Amino acid sequence: DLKTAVFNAARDGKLRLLTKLLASKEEVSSLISEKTNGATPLLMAARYGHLDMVEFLLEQCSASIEVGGSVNFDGETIEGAPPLWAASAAGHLKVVQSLLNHGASVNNTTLTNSTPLRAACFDGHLEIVKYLVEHKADLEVSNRHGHTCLMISCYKGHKEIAQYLLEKGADVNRKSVKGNTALHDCAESGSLDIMKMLLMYCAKMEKDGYGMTPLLSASVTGHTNIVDFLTHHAQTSKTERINALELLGATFVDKKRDLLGALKYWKKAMNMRYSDRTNIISKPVPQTLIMAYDYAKEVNSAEELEGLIADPDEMRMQALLIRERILGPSHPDTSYYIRYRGAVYADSGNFKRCINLWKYALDMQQSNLDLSFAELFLLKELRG
């Protein structure tokens, strides 16, 4: 437990202890290189910003500047992390500066292929982002999901960081492995200002792997500011606008529990559907009536909408019908909200209606293969 001694001295930065322990014992290289619970001494010194510990660990020994291990941020541990990455994630500009000035490689990644740049973008360390970019950081190295620095900056709502990255030449139209673009990240976080900034670079609106445009992503997540903006943008068609407002209404029923707000967006959508008398956009008709939906059908006229507010259970079946039509059975929100609706009926004593909804959610997710009950009793939020 000599290795464990010098390790806690570095981790905690109490330097005078380490200096005395080392100078008594060539072999010191073997000591500081001791990997204690994932972390090297260099890794813990940088992670907790002990500049002079880092400054001396490097200048005294052949201390390995690249050897990554485990580190911890807000409970979520990450692996393979070089010291430059840990300092970047934690925001220790001075540690970041001397690490680089001592020859650390600016683009060496964690296990999940996260760069120092991505880590500083995640936590909003603008000064660190500028220093990394001005010291040759590669803007386009994405993590293992293909999520870029720009995308996480947008997802986190870091406007000045996203702005700087676009000034530096970040590709605004990258897609992740799942088809996510930075426009989707703005939509999901409600970042209207950052979305407008991406449109200054002609960011293209695209469907992701789920078939979601950024307009639909804002509807799924309930960000009405994005939906209002994009339903008045020439790059969205009349039919996309109608479906986006109908889906947003469904989100208002199930996520916001706001039946009045839902009715407002459904009336807008019904108005658009009937605006041109020579080209009515009427509702698609599903193959069958569904028992779990109480055999309901979507309203197909403004007159069918005027009653609805007095009929909360009808509005709730409309919401399920809308989501299955627009999102489809392989989008995770569909079975999720079927199960949530079944749970609310269970809580009020209607177990038959609950069981039918749960059976149908289970049959749906078993029919579409290539948030469980136990689990309950998103992946962008990973610095890695």
Swiss-Prot record:
GO terms for molecular function: ubiquitin-like ligase-substrate adaptor activity. It comes from Homo sapiens (Human). Belongs to the fem-1 family. Changing E188K: Strongly reduced binding to C-degron with an arginine at the C-terminus. GO terms for cellular component: Cul2-RING ubiquitin ligase complex; cytosol; nucleoplasm; ubiquitin ligase complex. ANK repeats lie at residues 1-28, 37-67, 79-108, 112-141, 145-174, 178-207, 210-239. Substrate-recognition component of a Cul2-RING (CRL2) E3 ubiquitin-protein ligase complex of the DesCEND (destruction via C-end degrons) pathway, which recognizes a C-degron located at the extreme C terminus of target proteins, leading to their ubiquitination and degradation. The C-degron recognized by the DesCEND pathway is usually a motif of less than ten residues and can be present in full-length proteins, truncated proteins or proteolytically cleaved forms. Keywords: Acetylation, ANK repeat, Disease variant, Repeat, TPR repeat, Ubl conjugation pathway. It is linked to A dominant de novo FEM1C variant was identified in a patient with neurodevelopmental disorder with absent speech, pyramidal signs, and limb ataxia. Pathway: Protein modification; protein ubiquitination. Changing S114A: Abolished binding to C-degron with an arginine at the C-terminus. This is Protein fem-1 homolog C.
